[PDB]
Paper text:
Herein we present the development of a PluriZyme, TR2E2, with efficient native transaminase (k cat: 69.49±1.77 min−1) and artificial esterase (k cat: 3908–0.41 min−1) activities integrated into a single scaffold, and evaluate its utility in a cascade reaction. The reaction proceeds through the conversion of the β‐keto ester into the β‐keto acid at the hydrolytic site and subsequently into the β‐amino acid (e.e. >99 %) at the transaminase site. In addition, we report the crystal structures of the TR2 enzyme and the newly designed TR2E2 PluriZyme. It presents the typical type I fold of class III ω‐TA observed in known structures present in the PDB database, and it contains the characteristic pyridoxal‐5′‐phosphate (PLP)‐binding domain composed of β‐sheets and the catalytic base Lys289.
Diffracting crystals were obtained for TR2E2 as well. Datasets for each crystal were collected and refined to a resolution of 3.3 Å. Only purified TR2E2, which retained approximately 80 % of the original transaminase activity (k cat: 69.48±1.77 min−1), was capable of hydrolyzing pNPA, pNPP, and pNPB, with the latter being the preferred substrate (k cat: 0.41±0.05 min−1). This variant contains two mutations, A172S and Q173H. The artificial esterase catalytic triad was observed in the TR2E2 crystal structures and is composed of Ser172 and His173 of chain A (magenta) and Glu317 of chain B (green); similar to the transaminase's active site, the esterase site is composed of a functional protein dimer. The RMSD between TR2 and TR2E2 was calculated to be 0.71 Å between 299 of 389 C_α atoms of the aligned residues, indicating that no large conformational change occurs due to mutations, as also confirmed by the transaminase activity assay. Notably, the distance between both active sites is ≈20 Å, with the esterase site being more solvent‐exposed and located at the beginning of the tunnel and the transaminase site being more buried in the protein structure. Structural analysis revealed a 20 Å distance between both active sites, with the esterase site being solvent‐exposed and the transaminase site buried in the protein structure, thus ensuring that the transfer of the reaction intermediate within the protein structure is theoretically possible. When the residues Ser172 and His173 were replaced with Ala, the activity was completely abolished. Thus, the insertion of the hydrolytic site helped stabilize this region by adding two internal hydrogen bonds, improving the thermostability of the enzyme. The finding that both TR2 and TR2E2 retained high activity at 50–65 °C was consistent with their denaturation temperatures (56.23±0.09 °C and 61.85±0.11 °C, respectively), as revealed by circular dichroism spectroscopy.
Numbering used by the authors:
A (entry chain D): 36 to 86, 95 to 318, 323 to 459
B (entry chain A): 38 to 455
Write the structure that this text describes.
Amino acid sequence: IITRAEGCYLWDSDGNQILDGMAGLWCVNIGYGRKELAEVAYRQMQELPYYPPAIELSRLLSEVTPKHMNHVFFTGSGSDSNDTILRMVRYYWKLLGKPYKKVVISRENAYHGSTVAGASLSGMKAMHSHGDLPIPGIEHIEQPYHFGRAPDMDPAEFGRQAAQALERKIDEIGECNVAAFIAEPIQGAGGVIIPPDSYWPEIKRICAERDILLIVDEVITGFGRLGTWFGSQYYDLQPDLMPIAKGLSSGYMPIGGVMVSDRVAKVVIEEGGEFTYSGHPVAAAVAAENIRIMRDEGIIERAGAEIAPYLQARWRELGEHPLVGEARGVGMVAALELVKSKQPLERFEEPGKVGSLCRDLSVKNGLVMRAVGGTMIISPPLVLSREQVDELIDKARRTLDETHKAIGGALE
Amino acid sequence: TRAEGCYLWDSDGNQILDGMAGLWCVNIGYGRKELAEVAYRQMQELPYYNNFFQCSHPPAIELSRLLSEVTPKHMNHVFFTGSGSDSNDTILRMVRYYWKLLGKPYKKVVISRENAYHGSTVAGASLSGMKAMHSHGDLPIPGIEHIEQPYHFGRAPDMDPAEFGRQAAQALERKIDEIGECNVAAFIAEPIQGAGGVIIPPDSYWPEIKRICAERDILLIVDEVITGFGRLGTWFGSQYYDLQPDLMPIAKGLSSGYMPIGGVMVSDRVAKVVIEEGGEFFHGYTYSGHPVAAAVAAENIRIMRDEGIIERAGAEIAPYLQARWRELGEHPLVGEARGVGMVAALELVKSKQPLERFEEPGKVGSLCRDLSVKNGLVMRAVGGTMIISPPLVLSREQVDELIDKARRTLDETHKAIG
């Protein structure tokens, strides 16, 4: 229960300075305590609560987004973005005369939204059972999770394997029934599932020989999360559509959006114009300001220049702890792995509860940090300073140590 | 693009009376400076609401207490979401998953009406009845059916309304006997259809439908995205047409337009079940779409119930609006003036006594809408059907304003066509 929140810190009803390593929900990229936003909202509510903010917002988004992404359809949340995506991908092919080409393909343990459509896309089999949630035209392949899937196959080789999974499904369904393939650059919600560096190279190959669109879900990855403006350009992907949201406002306003490549855009706008526009004047004003800040203060550049590479090595230095098996780390996102043993490699029995115990103990020490099973993940704001990465390593250290004896002693 | 009260000024100092409440949303009118203060306030504190680490004074707490006060007695639990179109995607999920936990997983069908609107997501455009939306790919997703709209004008213009009302409402019973009673999960409708012209049902309809949903074993879902927060002169159209809905999405009006908000009111009946086994029903959004949105909305309702905007609607200015409007029924092109509370429609026809609709009525309405704003009125058209939802802060001197601008507009379209 916080009472004060600025910079990378919160403050309980007790007054401990808890450091938000998670950045709320992966989204307060420019950090708490920016009154510069709250004023642009105040004065945008004076002007108009309905409908200008949508235009200046669209300008900045075409500057920061590479490639042929020059048009943008805003929405209320990234959960609604993926809906528009699915709809306009089938609409794309329908306006090409291939209306049977409507099958979009996700991965297992990927997250793409809470809406019926987004949840059908999202591969959390927890969300899928409750009501009918594999709405016709969504398929689920393997995730490029090295640790979990094949912890001993060579990353170089395991990587090719998890992408040709895509090609396997394609040849299974009918290349002409597949509309597109969608996937987070790095699955965030389902733990930090970083793919090997052979994965996206093959995906790009499959999405060229087999005529499908690539859709890349940049909701957690967008707006600096990987030390680049988008996970897109950090893996040299040239997507056809990107749902952007959490980063947009840095977490202060409900705004979602889809970036569209000129390929899909042209057909949708020219041979269509019947699919109305924009999002919400307030939240757009607010969003366009958070990007001004990030652009002039360059804290996206600082994100790569200074605080990322430092935060990678330091995190990797956590991998030697007795509990830590793997120490994944790309840009301002990273993750550890809680295993009973490393040399014998015994995967913790029900690691859900043990990782839930480090989270529980991580705030007792004064660190925000998410568990997902036996995976401790972090996603600090892009304003975190090189000094505070040391605050982070230190408070994780005590936590893992405390839990190293807590299961190997107290009520084992 | 500046706005003050019920007026939208633009570049050339053009005071345009907004008779559309933007999009049925801006209810307490524009230029309520005290909402900006509550957004500036909350925005300065935390901007998320996870079960680990809450806020000082959680806004969704205040809000969800208030929504219990102004909603039908038996509704007392509110999930929040990002917009009202999200609210229905939730409801589709809830109504179904309600039966799975009553052990009837084959009970997954939702029935709507054609030309009903229910969101713009893949499910809200499946639910919704315009086939424009259905034709993109195949937006009708399984589980949904559609029955006939009780649109007395375009369906059976000469029938007896209480007869026809009773006839379009046996439609529901006649989809159940075609579908199988144990398959149907629920039936969802707006108290009055909004975005598809204002389809004011014959009084004898909601009477019947409540019976059909007693006799049959189905939940009920009343879409109050538009009818909610005073539109019908009652807080919710439910109270207007004495409906007791098991779910109810709410939205446009929750924040009177000021902030992206959605929400679903769960009747005690369905709530009892979705709580016993609800650890499974844990999704990313959970509740509290945004503390800032909730903070703003909570104050919005403060302003609404304390100055009394809902009450002076259905008791003072709504009556006035209805009377004035119907003085337009006595016009050449106009061959019906309907409305309730704070919503109203004019039908345009090529001849009154020979009831003769236009070859392509849509285009005439586009003209009228183009001619309304020219003369200084926001007035939307659904085909050949003009509609209006003025902000509930409307003053009498301004429905007078609202009527005369309509009069010119109708007299200029009458010229233009002839």
